[PDB]
Amino acid sequence: HHHHHMADQLTEEQIAEFKEAFSLFDKDGDGTITTKELGTVMRSLGQNPTEAELQDMINEVNGTIDFPEFLTMMARKMKDTDSEEEIREAFRVFDKDGNGYISAAELRHVMTNLGEKLTDEEVDEMIREAIDGQVNYEEFVQMMTAGGEEVSAVVLQRAYRGHLARRGF
Numbered sequence: 001h002h003h004h005h006m007a008d009q010l011t012e013e014q015i016a017e018f019k020e021a022f023s024l025f026d027k028d029g030d031g032t033i034t035t036k037e038l039g040t041v042m043r044s045l046g047q048n049p050t051e052a053e054l055q056d057m058i059n060e061v062n063g064t065i066d067f068p069e070f071l072t073m074m075a076r077k078m079k080d081t082d083s084e085e086e087i088r089e090a091f092r093v094f095d096k097d098g099n100g101y102i103s104a105a106e107l108r109h110v111m112t113n114l115g116e117k118l119t120d121e122e123v124d125e126m127i128r129e130a131i132d133g134q135v136n137y138e139e140f141v142q143m144m145t146a147g148g149e150e151v152s153a154v155v156l157q158r159a160y161r162g163h164l165a166r167r168g169f
Helices: 011-023 035-042 051-059 068-095 104-112 118-131 137-144 149-169
Strands: 032-036 065-066 101-103 134-136
Touching: 011 035, 011 068, 011 118, 032 035, 035 051, 035 065, 035 068, 051 104, 065 068, 068 104, 068 137, 068 149, 101 104, 104 118, 104 134, 104 149, 118 149, 137 149
Parallel strands: none
Antiparallel strands: 032 065, 101 134
């Protein structure tokens, strides 16, 4: 019926690169790898899934992974890696002294005055989830992962609204 695939988001070079790496881990040449190789082939390709991510991927699966499933796994993890990096860069934009912290006051301010402005209810929940009144934003990012300032603001608001949606259920 349909032709769409996550691999549509991959370049031809990536497909070839992922194919070479995958096959490098296929021992008996049956076109599949075992679940215990998944983490290592992903790392060999520059992706570092956490133990939880790996467990989630494996649960989606005779204990083997076929190539199209692997391409899908790669494409989805690459998307998450890119988003996570973008969220970190967006926070870094608002870290004026670059020390890895943002004041609760400053975070609340940029979230409500720039971009797709957070409501008082959204932002107050944000501050609650984020304080020692300093926000270690690296920790906040890891927690969410389970002008220049304008674009950065929207990155954070969309990331946070995504987190809120998941939490509402």
